[PDB]
From a paper:
Structural and functional analysis identified IPO as a member of the JRL family but with a different tetrameric association. The monomeric IPO from residues 1 to 154 shows a typical β-prism fold found in the JRL family, with 12 β-sheets (β3-β14) and 2 additional short, extended, N-terminal β-strands (β1-β2). Four IPO protomers form a compact tetrameric association by swapping their extended N termini from residues 1 to 10. Thus, the wound-inducible protein IPO from sweet potato has versatile carbohydrate binding properties and might play a role in plant defense.
IPO–Me-Man belongs to an orthorhombic space group C2221. The Matthew coefficient and solvent content for IPO–Me-Man had a reasonable value of 2.21 Å3/Da and 44.4% for 2 molecules in an asymmetric unit. Although only 2 IPO molecules were built in the IPO–Me-Man complex, the other 2 IPO molecules could be generated by symmetric operation (X, -Y, -Z) and resulted in a tetrameric association. In the structure of IPO–Me-Man, two IPO protomers were built, and only one Me-Man molecule could be observed in chain A. The temperature factor of Me-Man in the structure of IPO–Me-Man is 66.5 Å2, which is higher than that of Me-Glc, with 34.5 Å2. This phenomenon might indicate that only a few Me-Man molecules bound to IPO proteins in IPO–Me-Man, which resulted in a higher temperature factor. Nine hydrogen bonds are formed by the residues Gly21, Tyr97, Gly141, Trp142, Tyr143, and Asp145 of IPO and the atoms O1, O3, O4, O5 and O6 of Me-Man. The atom C7 of Me-Man is also involved in the Me…π interaction with Trp142 of IPO. The binding orientation of Me-Man is similar to that of Me-Glc. Me-Man and Me-Glc are epimers differing only at the C2 position, and IPO has no hydrogen bonds for C2 atom. The KA of IPO to Me-Man was the highest, 7.04×103 M−1.
Residue numbers in the entry:
A (entry chain A), B (entry chain A): 4 to 154
C (entry chain B), D (entry chain B): 2 to 154
The structure:
């Protein structure tokens, strides 16, 4: 028997939330869907984030609550994610993730979401890429951290 | 800011494998699909396991390889998983998980798969239930461990 | 023979910021002593440099600055019960965002805060019915981040 | 202010079996000393009771049996380089499936195996280009399970 390995982690950032969640697919996590209530002209409220690498490897964090989704944004990442960032602010009594941006060596995706709050940055040791995420969530996305491994 | 929490883990059991994977959905992980090559009368070879809690929260471990799937088994868990077990044996040069069984307080599901190999048992501290899994995988399922939290 | 999966404790945190090295200390027996070392003075401003955690003479960890230091201020905490909460403040020092203040809370007594009362506050609480049995974080010249290992009482 | 996510090292293992308490020790500085304590005798059979890991006098952990023990056999290992691999054997002792043998390997030297050469073998290797900077596991009266924390050289 050869001992199995578990990827290093960066984070989480954010606050304690109802449930722990973790998603680290074998294949490149390359598609993210952000869902919000509200509207662009009257502030977008991040409710849930859906991460996937393909049709049968996907997770939805936050969005457990009844609040109807009004707006969705699909992001297709074509490269290796090396950092994510965003803002944290209160929403209906909880400190949640309100905006998020993803950064690869080539380009940047976002920020998506609200514009106010306290900033967070999840970076990883040089020579690595982000291959999964974990955090705390319930009706909203409370905390988030990333799994990383060598490029 | 209130520090986020991360669930305890039991395992992994098995051997090092190409890629680390992790799946801990917010909602009850209640459906498992086991896919095999071969056949019941000539030995079933576990190739991949698909875990899910609903249509948009699912992961497939193993099954990256070309080997065509010939047989699938769907298991619907209606309760709280407290333990899993199975056998580990060699398959085309790798020590992989060859059979698996899931045990709840009410009933047991399986074993499913081959019948030979060295046994493994993933149990958890009393008063807890399994809410996710993690492990190593590539073409096959190399290692597996579980995330647990209070019932 | 038989592989019977081993368990790892749940975690709360880390909070703070990325630091040089990752560190971890979860001893088998109860933590019962914490030594905080600072430059400066309480009459003025205390600069938290290192934290020494231990459960006994042969189970101890030192995180944060350990190199050369002249006359330093020390604070020794002797814990009696189960630590259930930790808090403090984070702020910048010599170019690094480090833990500047820290307070340890058990059901029996509250210890601290110790240090400089300025910066962003942090709080490490754990699920009811649990106890903190270890800590982990990042550290270099100072204490950059910290989190806690917990398990059921 | 700003939350800059802290990093935690990758892990290899644990191997062995479930034990009483989870334990963890990842010191900032290089491990450089390991003390193994056994009942029995090398001329006969050595029963591994505890492992003491340390990087210096103020960074040490003791896992496994610590209670009363008469005359015990000791083995002190002084590590020089980066530990890259650990191995040993697991077998039953007084009703528990514990670590019975262990060997530590660095690029410069191999230390062990130490203990009883019987039972199921285990091997903790890490991804090429990395080094072991800590260990974790389960322990009680004996050493039940062990795994390693690793990071890039
Ligand atoms: C509305 O309450 C729910 O959702 C929030 C936020 O996501 C969680 O913190 C909380 O524990 C519940 O799950
Ligand atoms: C066939 O090789 C691939 O699949 C095996 C098993 O699942 C992994 O161990 C290996 O690293 C590769 O990913």
């Amino acid at each position: 028997q050869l001992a199995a390995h578990s990827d290093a982690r960066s984070g989480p950032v954010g606050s304690n939330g109802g449930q722990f969640w973790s998603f680290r697919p074998v294949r490149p996590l390359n598609k993210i869907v952000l869902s919000f209530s509200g509207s662009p002209d009257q502030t977008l409220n991040l409710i849930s984030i859906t991460f996937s690498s393909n049709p049968t490897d996907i997770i939805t964090v936050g969005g457990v609550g009844p609040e109807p989704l009004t707006y969705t944004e699909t992001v297709n990442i074509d490269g290796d994610i090396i950092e994510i960032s965003g803002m944290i602010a209160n929403y209906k009594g909880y400190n949640v993730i309100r905006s998020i941006k993803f950064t690869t060596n080539k380009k940047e995706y976002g920020p998506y979401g609200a514009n106010a709050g306290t900033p967070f940055n999840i970076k990883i040791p040089d020579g690595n890429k982000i291959v999964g995420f974990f955090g705390n969530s319930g009706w909203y996305v409370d905390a988030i951290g990333a799994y990383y491994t060598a490029k």
